[PDB]
Every structure is written in C-alpha cells, then in structure tokens.
Ligand binder design. Structure first.
Ligand SMILES: [Cl-]
Length: 516
C-alpha cells in the first residue's frame, strides 16, 4: 500500500471529455513524490485546442501523492487502496453555469500510477466564464475535506474551488467527490481530516500544442495559529549596522532573550511572546543580514553572527538574561552563555545545534538535500539562485501546512537573491560528520559547558524532529543538570509552528520557578 510511495513514482494521465457537444482528449505524464506531497506534470490536448479553460480540469486531472504526516498515516485511504486502486467520481457545480460529471480509475499499471478519466459537461452557457474562456491562467489554494463512507467501504470528499475570473470576480465550482476501492482487500477508512493544496500553472516555451504544466503540493492535516506580527519595530545600531528587534513586557526584572535560526526571524516567536510578556520582558532580535535587520555584504559565518549578537546584547545594556533559543540561535545562546555564565538564569531550547557525528543521524529524506546544500556549486544554485531553503526546506520543517500569509512573512527578507547569502552559509556551518572542524570544536565546547552547569534548562522536542531525534532528546534531558523536558507532539524543526501554545505556556510556568 504505502510501500509503493517511498520514492518518485511516474504518472500517466489520459482523459476523454464532452462539454456542450465539444469532444476532446488530454494526455499527461510526469512524476510524483509523496514525501513532499509533490506533483510535476505536463498535460497536452491531443485533439486540438481545449474547448474549456485549463484551470477547470485541474481537479479532474491522484490524491495518493498527498503527504500524510506520520501521526495520521492511518487515515491515508488513497495509498492503502493501491496497487488495485480506487474509483473516483465527482460532480462539479460551477456557480450559475454548467456542471462536470467525472468517473475515473486511479490504479497501478506496470510501474506507473495511471489516472484514466471520463468527463461529461452539460448546461453550460455559451457566453459564460467556462465556454467564454474568461478564466485567468492561475490557481488558488484550497482545503479538501475528507470523511469516511463505511457503507461503500469508501470516502466522501467535499470542497469548493475558487477560479479567478479576468474581470476580478471569482467563479465557484462546488465539488462532490466519492472514492471506493477496486480490490476487495481491506483499506483505511479515515477520521475527519482535510488536505491543504497549492498549485502553480505554467507553460513550456518549446511546446507547440495546447498544453498545461502543473506543480502541486498537498499536505494532510486536521487531526491532532495566528499569522499576525503586531509588534512595534525597534532598531539599535550595532557595529555600524542597524538591527531590528521586538521589545515588550515590563521594563524591570530579568529580560528573556529569544534567538531564531535559519531561515526564520523574530516572526517565529510571534505566538510564544504573548505567553511571556505579561510577566517578563521579551527581546527578540532579527539576526544580522536577516529579518528586518540590515543586510551588509558579509561572509555570514557563525562567527559573524557571534560578533553582532555580542554587540547587540551590550547595546541594550542587558545584565542577567533568560534564553529561549532555536536552531542557530541556540548555538549563539550556548556559546555566549559559556563565555558569560554568571549572566544566564535559565535556558529554554528546542531543536538546537549539536555535534552530529554521522549523516545516518540526519533525517534520511533530507540527507541528499542538505549534502547538496553544502556545496559551492549546486548548493549556491539551490539556495541563492532558486531560494529552495525558503520555498521548500522551510515548509518541510513544519508538520502543518504553512499558509501563504506566513510564507510571505518568511519570504520578505530574501526577495532579492543577493540577500540570501546567510541562507546558504548556515547549512554549510552545520557540524555534521566532523565538518566544519571549527564549528564542531566550538559546539563541543558549549555542550561540555552545558553538562557541567547548574543553570535551569528546559528542552522542547517533537517527533520525529530533525536536529534532535526523540531518543537524543531523552538522553540529554537525563544527563544535563536541572533539565526539564517537554514533548510537544509531532514536529520537525520549527516546533513553534506546530504547538506554540504549549511552548509559550510551559515557558511562562517554568519562568516562575527561577530566581530572577
Ligand atoms: Cl541551517
């Protein structure tokens, strides 16, 4: 079942349709990778020009390539129906226009997952958005709702597609879907969940025939978060550069310093700060060359971030601090704490920088990618030229699907590809397999200092994690002095995006037990 989807699967799509007496056929082929929920396909019209706009056919033209996270892999009906496959039937109601009626078989034929469909459209106005071709060549992001249909041993699916019309209006296409398996072998009948979808339509500049190129990403969710950033912007001059930081909470007492990593900013602390501000001052700077801080032309090694954070702390006159750190902000926090141990009253850390002795400790699905990130040729193309760390690695570091509002918040500091230099130097500084030896030695030193320190420690971890596997999170919580471990449930690297209420509330509760 799910075993046939561990790699890249070739896809073939063939449709035969009839809309208002207009007959047409479409062929398509490509490849799917359920690990990312990814689809790459090109569809051509084999009978001439399409009598309907291409966006109307997207949903008809293989939801088995959706990415089901591990904690809801028992709700993936589509994969458990393979290789025999399932029958998919739909009735799509275009608002104030016609309707499509489709019937398809999604099955394995040889080594290819093929999707053969019949389509039939009726009652379409000749001057409507569909037959008049008033649809814009784009596509929106939708929520596809799934529930079990134990009578037919299948599922019932409902959602509403929003098609952009060229006059600025929206055409609604109400979807009513039904999937039942082809083979009698038992399948998975899921609880109520949904799929978060996103699609990008484009053209091949060398294709002469009427065609459509499609890139799609789908992620299941809804079986177990504010997007705003209401903080007033603050700036301080640090080594001739301006650095942006959030400053809230009472002015007295021990401040709490929040340190982000790659490729985020203080935006990753937007849902944690409100739990801490009512009792403690919250300081959350944007790293140099990141966020809203100035982006000078540096090599942006870890040492460069050490210089600017040291001068940021002194610029704000901070005496004693509590640290809430994540990813490379944790290496900055532990290193500074090792060098200023009399000024740290507590450390709350999550998915933090540690010496990774072998690549087999790295997430196997992300090993090929991060080894390609750590090259001066392919690595710069991926991160600098193509912005893969923002568009791909970042949404793969969150179990739940990041919305477009949240992605645009992370996209803003790196709209210009020349400013993406810290996005590429950071993964090359990761101490993996003994390289680079200077970071390995530095990280080994603050890990050693941490093991001999009585400072309060609070470790957040998730499953399966990335930097900190669950077994490693359990080992360190036992041997580190005065450590309290918290399991936040499922998680990859940005644990603040999967369970921000548990992180912030436990920190607010843990902060009261310290002497500050
Ligand atoms: Cl990184």
């Amino acid at each position: 079942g799910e075993e046939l989807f561990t790699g890249v699967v070739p896809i073939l799509v063939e449709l035969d349709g009839d809309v208002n007496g207009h007959k047409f056929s479409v062929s398509g082929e490509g490849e799917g990778d359920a690990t990312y929920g990814k689809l790459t396909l090109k569809f051509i019209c084999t009978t001439g020009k399409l009598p309907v706009p291409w966006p109307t056919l997207v949903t008809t033209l293989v939801q088995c390539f959706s990415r089901y996270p591990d904690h809801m892999k028992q709700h993936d009906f589509f994969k458990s129906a393979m290789p025999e496959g399932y029958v998919q039937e739909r009735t799509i109601f275009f608002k104030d226009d016609g309707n499509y009626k489709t019937r398809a078989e999604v099955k394995f034929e040889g080594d290819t997952l093929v999707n053969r469909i019949e389509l039939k459209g009726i009652d379409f106005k000749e001057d409507g958005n569909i037959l008049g071709h008033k649809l814009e060549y784009n596509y929106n992001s939708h929520n596809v709702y799934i529930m079990a249909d134990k009578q037919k041993n299948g599922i019932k699916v409902n959602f509403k597609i929003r098609h952009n019309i060229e006059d600025g209006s929206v055409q609604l296409a109400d979807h009513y879907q039904q999937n039942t398996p082809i083979g009698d072998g038992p399948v998975l009948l899921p609880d109520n969940h949904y799929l978060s979808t996103q699609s990008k339509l484009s053209k091949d500049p060398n294709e002469k025939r009427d065609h459509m190129v499609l890139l799609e990403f789908v992620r299941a969710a809804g079986i177990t978060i504010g997007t705003g950033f209401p903080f007033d912007p603050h700036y301080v001059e640090v080594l001739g550069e301006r650095m942006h930081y959030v400053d809230v909470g009472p002015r007295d007492g021990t401040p709490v310093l929040f340190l982000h990593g790659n490729p985020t900013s203080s935006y990753v602390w937007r849902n944690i700060i409100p739990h801490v501000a009512p009792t403690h001052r919250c300081i959350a700077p944007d790293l140099i060359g990141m966020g809203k801080s100035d982006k000078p032309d540096l090599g942006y090694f870890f040492d460069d971030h050490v210089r600017f954070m040291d001068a940021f702390i002194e610029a704000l006159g901070l005496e004693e601090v509590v640290l809430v750190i994540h990813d490379w902000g944790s290496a900055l926090g532990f290193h500074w704490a090792k060098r200023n141990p009399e000024r740290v009253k507590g450390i709350a850390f999550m998915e933090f920088i540690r010496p990774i002795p072998t690549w087999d400790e790295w997430p196997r699905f992300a090993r090929r990618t991060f080894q390609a990130f750590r090259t001066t040729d392919v690595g710069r193309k991926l991160i600098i030229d193509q912005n893969v760390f923002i568009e791909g690695t970042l949404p793969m570091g969150v179990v739940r699907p990041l919305t477009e509002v949240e992605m645009d918040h992370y996209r803003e500091p790196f709209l210009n590809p020349v400013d993406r230099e810290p996005l590429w130097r950071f993964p090359n500084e990761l101490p993996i397999a003994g390289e680079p030896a200077n970071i390995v030695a530095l990280v080994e030193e603050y890990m050693d200092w941490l093991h001999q320190s009585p400072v309060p420690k609070l470790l957040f971890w998730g499953t399966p994690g990335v930097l900190i596997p669950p077994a490693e999170a359990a080992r360190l919580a036992k041997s580190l002095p005065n450590c309290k471990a918290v399991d936040i449930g499922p998680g990859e690297n940005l644990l603040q995006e999967d369970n921000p209420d548990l992180i912030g509330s436990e920190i607010a509760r843990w902060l009261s037990t310290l002497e500050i």
